[PDB]
């Protein structure tokens, strides 16, 4: 029978470790070898999170080191912790594998989005059809506000583009933006190539850049602390992990250079819109231009449906007149 | 000129003329679109249905609430609500009558912006005002001091007012009211095997909530009584002739109001919110707030809520203070009553927002004029 | 003197747009968008004022 | 219902098993329903022939993906409710914000109904459209998912701490068949 | 001009004019071919008899139903039915008359496709429409809502219509009707 498993743990933690161990579909010696070799193929964020959440405790390590009987009498959990205690700097190796996989995940997460945000700022500073379209909106608004204090102006802010769909006609179906695009479909079609410049401003950030920047800075700080602990550790851990740490710190330093470039382009976009930089001129401008591009394409689609319905109504009227 | 009072709450709209007691047009604020596609002829079928007409044909209509937790989501649906309550229910022009409007406290300001823009551009008025529902509930209470718990369909808010001076830092808003109680009741009727998954069934479960549900004086004693005996079980006939019978779910539904951990909300009950809003005030005025606890809104129309509220406040407060719950039978209509009281005031006639003020200041004077 | 300010006065009453008026000196800055638009060599798109007077005017 | 468009009538219970075998063999989840419908309308590349046990051969086209599209678009049968990706996103938004990042990267799909060979990329696309671009979206799709509940039961069978959790005959005689409510969740 | 209402039912075809009360030509849809040998020379010996003439001479004719359970099987036979009810029964020009046609629910689509092809190409029309039979039965009832149990000669279907709107998920088709009752009686 042998029920005396001499397990120093309780039931729940040994239960969760027996849940955790059985998904590897192999012996715990292979698990201890993969910890010692630093192999990150089978070790994603969640597995190493569960492994750090099922760490051995101080009295558990003391009872394992005071165990003087036969090691086959132990359970698989206590034998796995003895294999884990056999690895020198095992928690350091687990933290290196977790931080390397998490650093690769956060870098592949943030860096194309940060390149999208930088390309969005570069296309918002330099846009081709945007001054001609803003001059047309300015001339139409100066005709519309003739005789009021808002009229006879030489410009407007970027929040006016959100307010274009607020003004509607007598029918309350064709807006100001819909009428301007119905006129621009006939006269100046190059303004319909406005989203091709705004396609890198399309989809915005969609995120808070301070959240990913604080996560990137905290990950870089954790990588620096980890590289300092590996530099205090043995040379096997150094030859295992120092090149990966150096590549991760170098890529996050390139990410911080990219974030400083986004700050410089944010100040340039604040000076572009003639607004102070103390207000949010970064995420509000991305959300404003994303909503402007979505309303622009929706005005194109609704004017297309309006012209198709008018042509189908003309065809139905001609077919009723012929019959 | 007869002023208008149009309480546009989240679930229902109570509109009518000022200087009146009973609200003239009470109808639910639902917009019914046709769920299934079909053109036919139908002798001029309507493309959308408002309120009682949407309630009548609700089996084949997708029902949309334009207001969620006191905040207007679909503004065109709200414009259709406004067009039906101006032209069909009351049958009055907007440009020949001033119209007082209500608002929950701690509203985001763009709702007030678009409300002012719609009420001056497309449904243009000679004058309008945007007010606070708890102030009108205290006007229907008739006193000047006291704290008001106003619980509509999405918003339950506690507002203390001393001598006509509302304290803005002590206003406490919790987004838990009768729609969330209806959604919790739809969640808990599936224990007995009855399934309600559509929005038309939400009206049936809401009618079950309005008729059969009640506030327990003690939750654990009522739970032990319902577990022991079936004397608290009540039957209800469904519109297809089926009869259901429910036990503890009569009083399990309002206990979300006193214990929001049932639906996983981490906030405390409305009694603790009331006690924290009273204790956020100055220490000199708290005795008037304990004696003038005013309950309004239709969510507080369950026939055990004043006794349970008095029990929980007297458990929370020091015992030397006199605990009094002001619970009128007309607390459902009290916001519209106080709106008629405020619009009937001759001193309030200097406080209206004119069309010329809207033209001069843009859509921005309503933050400076209204509180 | 610029092309965009040369607006013919409407005979009928026109509907009012809402925007916050920029100053003329800020908009005619050399880094600003509108100083190149105030130049006559830029493409001055003339609005069809007859269509806006036909459509967007106030009904009596 | 939709196999009668081409004229293959099925009214009996054995025909339900035959169409169930057809659904298990031929049907698949489309990545984009409108492009697949336009392609099936344009060219007959997706048309596949099935041989019935009597010897007759049928051929179906767009219905290989129109049948699991009811999983994403439940208004096809008139079941007016949200899609299963929308059901998943609303179940995620019912949770706390602290634990949402864990659930975004741990989307396990079980059952044989999820054994269509297009479901993971479409499900990741729909969740990535529904969720914001903050957190990592990862769909867990094991090949042995159809028996996985049984497999998990076998995982729960041999464990050492499960011996106290067994509902005995004596506990059944003591507490009726009602200790399963207070013991199991 | 005057529209034409022609119910091409499974057993019987009922044709007539729009706005009229009783259908003008009610006749069973059968095709009668001679099965024995003809011995008299001349005398207008046709190779196919249609409808009431096929009903009259039915002792020497093999009879074929072109519609089987709401599905047109032989399209040439249905072409002969349509030519007979257009040119012999009603005696109208199809190029100057709109035409309504009736169809069973849950019917295969290519039947409707070939009906559109024959009624636009063979008998070309100014206009045509294809309508569900239960909708027409509720319109003859005059009430806006209800449920129609329509059982012809080939198809028995249950269709509920509420406030003029059809609910397609509850449409229930069963191919058990009076021809199968006739075969069970035989
Ligand atoms: N008899 C009742 N029992 C319980 N709740 C009710 C009852 N009558 C109305 N209500 C609730 O009152 C709310 C309607 O508020 P109402 O008093 O009409 O103000 P408003 O018109 O501003 O919404 C609805 O949410 C409804 O749930
Ligand atoms: N008096 C009657 N009693 C019972 N059944 C009848 C009677 N008269 C006709 N029928 C049945 O109804 C069928 C005719 O239905 P019909 O109106 O032609 O439907 P459809 O137009 O859809 O073919 C015949 O086949 C016959 O079996
Ligand atoms: Mg109201
Ligand atoms: Mg028929």
For residues B91 and B11, what is the distance between their CA atoms, to the nearest angstrom? Answer: 22
Task: Pick from B69, B178, B205, B213 the residue to mutate for probing ligand 1's pocket: most ligand atoms within 8 Å of its CB.
Answer: B178
DSSP state of B54: H
CA of B28 relative to ligand 3 center, distance in Å: 9
User: How many other CB atoms are found less than 10 A from the CB of residue A239?
Assistant: 10
Residue B178: which of B77, B299, B89 has the closest Cα?
B299
Domain B182-270, what fold?
Answer: Actin; Chain A, domain 4 (3.90.640)
- The number of the ligand 2 atom at minimal distance from the alpha carbon of E10 is 23
Ligand 2, atom 21, lies closest to the CA of E9
Q: Are B327 and B306 in contact (CB under 8 A)?
A: yes
Residues having CB closer than 6 A to ligand 1 are B 7, 9-14, 152-153, 178, 210, 297-299, 301, 332, 335
Return the CATH number of B135-181+271-333, one of 3.30.420.40, 2.60.120.430, 3.20.20.300, 3.40.47.10: 3.30.420.40
Distance between first and last Cα of chain B: 25
CA distances to B273, D54, D90, E21 from B332, rounded to whole Å, are 21, 70, 33, 58
For residues E129 and E119, what is the distance between their CA atoms, to the nearest angstrom? Answer: 10
Residue E63: which of E78, E49, E73, E44 has the closest Cα?
E49
Yes or no, beta carbons of A135 and C24 under 8 Å apart:
no
Yes or no, beta carbons of C34 and A131 under 8 Å apart:
yes
Residue B8: which of B109, B126, B119 has the closest Cα?
B119
CATH code assigned to B1-27+70-134+334-370: 3.30.420.40
Residue B282's SS3 state is coil
Domain chopping of chain B, boundaries: 1-27+70-134+334-370, 28-69, 135-181+271-333, 182-270
Task: Pick from B22, B298, B334 the residue to mutate for probing ligand 1's pocket: most ligand atoms within 8 Å of its CB.
Answer: B298
Residues having CB closer than 6 A to ligand 2 are E 7, 9-12, 152-153, 178
Per DSSP (E only), the strands in chain C are none
CATH code assigned to E1-27+70-134: 3.30.420.40
Strand partners, E7: E14
Q: Smallest CA–CA separation between D54 and chain E, in Å?
A: 22
For domain D1-84, which architecture applies?
A: Alpha-Beta Complex (3.90)
Q: Smallest CA–CA separation between A131 and chain C, in Å?
A: 6
Q: Give all strands of the β-sheet with E49-50 in edge-to-edge order.
A: E49-50, E31-34, E61-64
For residues D87 and B297, what is the distance between their CA atoms, to the nearest angstrom? Answer: 33
Best of D76, D77, D80, D87 to substitute, by most chain B Cβ atoms within 10 angstroms, is D80
Residue B190's SS3 state is helix
CA of B301 relative to ligand 1 center, distance in Å: 8
Alpha helices in D26-168 (DSSP H): 33-42, 63-66, 69-72, 84-93, 100-104, 119-130, 148-155
For residues A74 and A57, what is the distance between their CA atoms, to the nearest angstrom? Answer: 17
A293-296's contacts with Cβ under 8 Å and 24+ in sequence apart are A293/A195, A293/A198, A293/A201, A293/A202, A295/A164, A295/A165, A295/A177, A296/A177, A296/A181, A296/A194, A296/A195
- The number of the ligand 1 atom at minimal distance from the alpha carbon of B179 is 25
Yes or no, beta carbons of B42 and E164 under 8 Å apart:
yes
D164 in contact with A at a CB cutoff of 8 Å?
yes
Q: Are B142 and B331 in contact (CB under 8 A)?
A: no
Place of tokens 């298990």: D24
CA of E153 relative to ligand 2 center, distance in Å: 6
For residues D49 and B344, what is the distance between their CA atoms, to the nearest angstrom? Answer: 79
CA of E125 relative to ligand 1 center, distance in Å: 59
| Closest residue on chain B to D75 (Cα) | B36
Task: Pick from B102, B103, B304, B332 the residue to mutate for probing ligand 1's pocket: most ligand atoms within 8 Å of its CB.
Answer: B332
Return the CATH number of B28-69, one of 3.30.420.40, 3.60.20.10, 2.30.36.70, 2.30.30.90: 2.30.36.70
Strand partners, B6: B15, B101
Yes or no, beta carbons of A142 and C7 under 8 Å apart:
yes
Yes or no, beta carbons of A141 and C26 under 8 Å apart:
no
Angle, alpha carbons D148-D151-D153 (nearest 5°): 115
Best of E134, E143, E163, E168 to substitute, by most chain B Cβ atoms within 10 angstroms, is E163
CA of E152 relative to ligand 2 center, distance in Å: 6
Determination approach: cryo-EM
Alpha helices in B232-343 (DSSP H): 249-252, 255-258, 270-279, 286-291, 305-316, 334-343
The two three-digit tokens of residue B301, written as one number: 């129309």
Residues in chain D with CB shorter than 8 Å from the CB of A48 are none
- The number of the ligand 2 atom at minimal distance from the alpha carbon of E181 is 27
DSSP secondary structure, B35-47, as one string: SS-----TTT--S
CA of E181 relative to ligand 2 center, distance in Å: 11
Name the phi and psi angles at D49, rounded to 5.
-100, 135
**Beta-carbon contacts of residue D12 (< 8 Å; ≥ 6 apart):** none
Q: Are A250 and A107 in contact (CB under 8 A)?
A: no
B224-230's contacts with Cβ under 8 Å and 24+ in sequence apart are B226/B251
DSSP state of D178: G
What residues of E are in the B interface, CB distance below 8 Å?
Answer: 144, 162-167
Nearest to C19 among A141, A147, A170 (CB): A141
**Beta-carbon contacts of residue D60 (< 8 Å; ≥ 6 apart):** D3, D6, D22, D26, D47, D48, D50
Resolution at which this structure was determined, Å: 3.8
Q: Smallest CA–CA separation between D97 and chain B, in Å?
A: 12
**What is chain D's length?**
185
**Beta-carbon contacts of residue C14 (< 8 Å; ≥ 6 apart):** A143, A144, A146, A147, C52, C53, C56, C57, C58
Residue B215: which of B337, B321, B134, B327 has the closest Cα?
B327
For residues D166 and D145, what is the distance between their CA atoms, to the nearest angstrom? Answer: 26
The two three-digit tokens of residue D42, written as one number: 């344009």
B58-77 in b/e form (b: 16+ CB < 10 A) is bebbbbbbbbebbbbeeeeb
Ligand 2, atom 3, lies closest to the CA of E178
**Beta-carbon contacts of residue E12 (< 8 Å; ≥ 6 apart):** E26, E27, E28, E29, E153
Write down which chains contact chain D via at least 3 CB pairs under 8 A: A, B, E
Nearest to D5 among E108, E174, E175 (CB): E108
For residues A222 and A226, what is the distance between their CA atoms, to the nearest angstrom? Answer: 6
Alpha helices in chain C (DSSP H): 24-27, 34-37, 49-55
Strand partners, B128: B99, B353
Residues in chain B with CB shorter than 8 Å from the CB of D94 are 264
Name the phi and psi angles at B191, rounded to 5.
-70, -35
CA distances to A89, B74, E58, E81 from E32, rounded to whole Å, are 97, 66, 7, 11
CA of B303 relative to ligand 1 center, distance in Å: 14
Residues in chain E with CB shorter than 8 Å from the CB of D10 are none
CA distances to A42, B166, D50, D58 from D55, rounded to whole Å, are 49, 84, 10, 10
Q: Are E166 and E115 in contact (CB under 8 A)?
A: no
Residue B294's SS3 state is strand
Strand partners, B298: none
Best of A7, A12, A45 to substitute, by most chain D Cβ atoms within 10 angstroms, is A45
Helical (H) or strand (E) element with B49: strand B49-50
- The number of the ligand 2 atom at minimal distance from the alpha carbon of E11 is 23
CA distances to A94, B253, D59, D62 from D48, rounded to whole Å, are 51, 54, 5, 10
Residue A249: which of A92, A103, A95, A44 has the closest Cα?
A103
Q: In the structure, how many helices (H) and strands (E) does chain D have?
A: 10, 4
């Amino acid at each position: 029978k042998e029920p005396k498993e001499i397990t120093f743990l309780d039931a729940k933690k040994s239960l969760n470790l027996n849940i955790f161990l059985k998904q590897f579909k192999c012996s715990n010696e292979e698990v201890a070898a993969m910890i010692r070799a630093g192999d990150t193929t089978k070790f994603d964020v969640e597995v190493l999170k569960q492994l750090l959440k099922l760490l051995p405790e101080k009295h558990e390590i003391e009872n394992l080191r005071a165990f003087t009987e036969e090691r086959a009498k132990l359970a698989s959990a206590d034998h796995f912790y003895l294999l884990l205690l056999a690895i020198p700097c095992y928690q350091l190796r687990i933290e290196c594998m977790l931080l390397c996989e998490g650093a690769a995940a956060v870098l592949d997460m943030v860096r194309p989005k940060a390149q999208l945000v930088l390309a969005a700022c570069e296309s918002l500073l330099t846009s081709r059809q945007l001054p001609i379209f803003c001059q047309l909106i300015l001339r139409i608004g100066n005709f519309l506000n003739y005789g009021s204090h808002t009229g006879d102006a030489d410009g407007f802010k970027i929040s006016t583009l959100l307010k274009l769909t607020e003004t509607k006609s007598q029918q309350n179906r064709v807006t100001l933006l819909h009428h301007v695009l119905e006129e621009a479909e006939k006269s100046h079609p190059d303004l319909l190539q406005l989203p091709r410049d705004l396609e890198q401003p399309s989809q915005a950030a969609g995120i808070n850049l301070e959240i990913i920047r604080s996560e990137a800075s905290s990950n870089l700080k954790k990588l620096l602390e980890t590289e300092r602990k590996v530099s205090a550790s043995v040379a096997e851990v150094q030859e295992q992990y120092t090149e990966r740490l150096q590549a991760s710190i170098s890529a996050f330093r390139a990410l911080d250079e990219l974030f400083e470039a986004i700050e410089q382009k944010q100040r340039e976009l604040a000076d572009y819109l003639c607004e102070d930089a103390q207000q949010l001129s970064l995420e509000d401008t991305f959300s404003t231009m994303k909503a402007f591009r979505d309303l622009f394409l929706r005005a194109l689609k609704e004017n297309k449906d309006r012209k198709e319905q008018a042509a189908k109504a003309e065809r139905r009227k001609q077919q009723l007149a012929e019959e | 000129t007869t002023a208008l009072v149009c309480d546009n709450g989240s679930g229902l709209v109570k509109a009518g003329f000022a200087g009146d007691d009973a609200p003239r047009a009470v109808f639910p604020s639902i917009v019914g679109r046709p769920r299934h596609q079909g053109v036919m002829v139908g002798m001029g079928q309507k493309d959308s249905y408002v309120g009682d007409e949407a309630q009548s044909k609700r089996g084949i209509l997708t029902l949309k609430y334009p207001i969620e937790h006191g905040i207007i989501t679909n503004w065109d649906d709200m414009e259709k609500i406004w067009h039906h309550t101006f032209y069909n229910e009351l049958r009055v022009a907007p440009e020949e009558h001033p119209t007082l409007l209500t608002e929950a406290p701690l509203n985001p300001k763009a709702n007030r912006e678009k409300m002012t823009q719609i009420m001056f551009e497309t449904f243009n008025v000679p004058a309008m005002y945007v007010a606070i529902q708890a102030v009108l509930s205290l006007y229907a209470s008739g006193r000047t001091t006291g704290i008001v718990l106003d619980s509509g369909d999405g918003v339950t808010h506690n507002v203390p007012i001393y001598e006509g001076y509302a304290l803005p830092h002590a206003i406490m808003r919790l987004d838990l009211a009768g729609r969330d109680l209806t959604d919790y009741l739809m969640k808990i009727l599936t224990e007995r095997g009855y399934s309600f998954v559509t929005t038309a069934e939400r009206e049936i479960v809401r009618d079950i909530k309005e008729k059969l549900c009640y506030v327990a004086l003690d939750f654990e004693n009522e739970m032990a009584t319902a577990a022991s005996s079936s004397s608290l079980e009540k039957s209800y006939e469904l519109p297809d002739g089926q009869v259901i019978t429910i036990g503890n779910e009569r009083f399990r539904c309002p206990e979300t109001l006193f214990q929001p951990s049932f639906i996983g909300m981490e906030s405390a009950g409305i009694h603790e919110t009331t006690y924290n809003s009273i204790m956020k005030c100055d220490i000199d005025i708290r005795k008037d707030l304990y004696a003038n606890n005013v309950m309004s809104g239709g969510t507080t129309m369950y026939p055990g809520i004043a006794d349970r509220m008095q029990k929980e406040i007297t458990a929370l407060a020091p015992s030397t203070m006199k605990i009094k719950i002001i619970a009128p039978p007309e607390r459902k209509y009290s916001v519209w009553i106080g709106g008629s009281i405020l619009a009937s005031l001759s001193t309030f006639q200097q406080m209206w927002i004119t069309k010329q003020e809207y033209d001069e200041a843009g859509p921005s004077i309503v933050h400076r004029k209204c509180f | 003197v610029p092309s965009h300010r040369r607006v013919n006065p409407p005979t009928l009453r026109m509907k009012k747009l809402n925007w916050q008026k920029l100053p003329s000196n800020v908009a005619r800055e050399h880094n600003s968008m509108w100083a190149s638009l105030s130049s006559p060599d830029a493409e001055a798109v003339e609005p069809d004022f007859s269509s806006i007077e036909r459509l967007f005017s106030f009904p009596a």
